[PDB]
Amino acid sequence: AQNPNCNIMIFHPTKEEFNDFDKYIAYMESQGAHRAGLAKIIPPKEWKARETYDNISEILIATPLQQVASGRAGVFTQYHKKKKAMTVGEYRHLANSKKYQTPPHQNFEDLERKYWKNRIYNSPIYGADISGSLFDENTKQWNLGHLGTIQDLLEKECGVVIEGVNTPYLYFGMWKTTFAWHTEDMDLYSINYLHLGEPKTWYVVPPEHGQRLERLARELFPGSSRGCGAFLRHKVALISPTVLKENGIPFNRITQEAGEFMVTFPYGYHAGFNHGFNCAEAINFATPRWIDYGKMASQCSCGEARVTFSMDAFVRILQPERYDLWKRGQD
Ligand SMILES: O=C(O)CNC(=O)C(=O)O
Ligand SMILES: [Mg+2]
Ligand code: NI
Ligand SMILES: [Zn+2]
Numbered sequence: 001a002q003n004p005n006c007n008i009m010i011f012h013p014t015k016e017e018f019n020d021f022d023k024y025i026a027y028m029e030s031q032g033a034h035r036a037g038l039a040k041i042i043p044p045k046e047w048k049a050r051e052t053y054d055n056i057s058e059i060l061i062a063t064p065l066q067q068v069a070s071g072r073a074g075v076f077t078q079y080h081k082k083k084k085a086m087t088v089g090e091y092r093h094l095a096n097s098k099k100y101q102t103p104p105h106q107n108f109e110d111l112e113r114k115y116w117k118n119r120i121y122n123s124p125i126y127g128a129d130i131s132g133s134l135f136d137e138n139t140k141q142w143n144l145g146h147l148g149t150i151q152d153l154l155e156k157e158c159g160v161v162i163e164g165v166n167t168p169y170l171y172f173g174m175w176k177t178t179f180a181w182h183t184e185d186m187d188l189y190s191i192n193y194l195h196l197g198e199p200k201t202w203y204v205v206p207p208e209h210g211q212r213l214e215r216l217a218r219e220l221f222p223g224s225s226r227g228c229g230a231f232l233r234h235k236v237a238l239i240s241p242t243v244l245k246e247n248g249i250p251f252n253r254i255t256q257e258a259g260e261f262m263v264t265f266p267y268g269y270h271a272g273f274n275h276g277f278n279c280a281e282a283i284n285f286a287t288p289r290w291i292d293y294g295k296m297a298s299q300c301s302c303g304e305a306r307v308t309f310s311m312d313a314f315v316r317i318l319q320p321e322r323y324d325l326w327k328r329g330q331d
Pocket of ligand 4: 227228229302305
């Protein structure tokens with residue numbers, strides 16, 4: 001078995017290997033990359049996502065989200081308070097302000113210490129989940145707006161044609177902006193490209209151990225667990241690396257820098273934080289190996305998780321017994 005300790009693997013594809021996206025994912029899996037739940041891909045030196053980032057300031061962030069924490073430094077939830085619209089240039093100025101900017105630090109490990117010590121005492125503002133793309137249309141390799149769709153994959157594997165669409169999303173971050181512990185909708189893959197700015201630190205639990213994280217979470221968030229049998233689908237709970245280690249939960253960590261891709265694998269729980277002003281693009285995707293995970297994915301039906309239009313067909317075809325209850329949660 002390849003990668004039996006479930007370490008995060010880093011890949012350096014050549015320009016020739018960067019042509020065929022599906023083939024390269026399958027290659028990474030042949031080497032055991034999926035066992036970690038997360039892999040890093042450093043693009044060939046010849047590649048670029050677009051020519052420059054000099055002209056992005058007028059993108060609108062219609063609903064910036066202030067991430068307000070509750071709990072203790074290593075075990076907390078966050079809620080999202082909606083703020084007034086602002087442009088990317090306005091948001092960048094805000095991220096760089098004395099109130100929000102990255103503190104002085106020695107290295108990524110010092111900054112990570114400072115994040116976990118101090119996160120809960122601040123409420124950073126995240127421009128998340130903005131439909132759109134920063135890849136140039138002429139970028140032919142690893143262009144996250146030009147990937148094979150999940151609907152087409154399901155149709156190819158299973159023969160059933162379904163409604164729905166699959167487009168990327170932009171994320172504008174600042175110091176301390178946080179992504180809570182989660183797997184993707186329907187335990188899909190994700191791919192995330194850090195277009196510009198400061199790094200993103202990731203934490204990940206191997207897919208084979210995801211239920212250990214779920215059992216800890218039920219213990220640490222006992223009210224939430226009574227409310228919903230899949231409350232991590234709400235994407236609000238944070239648990240620090242120190243608390244994971246104290247409870248024997250297997251995990252790994254890695255920092256993504258500008259110009260790098262990350263892939264999350266089916267049922268790989270992940271969480272993390274941004275170091276300072278940045279912009280990332282991400283999208284879900286599927287492969288043949290996903291189908292069995294999609295069939296077994298948990299679902300929130302309490303009403304909290306509310307998701308896209310396109311998840312309806314995935315539930316309906318892959319999980320017909322659960323469909324009626326899940327759809328009630330949607331309505
Ligand atoms: O970058 C973020 O805020 C969160 N991203 C992801 O969870 C992802 O790409 O799967
Ligand atoms: Mg612009
Ligand atoms: Ni994710
Ligand atoms: Zn729920």
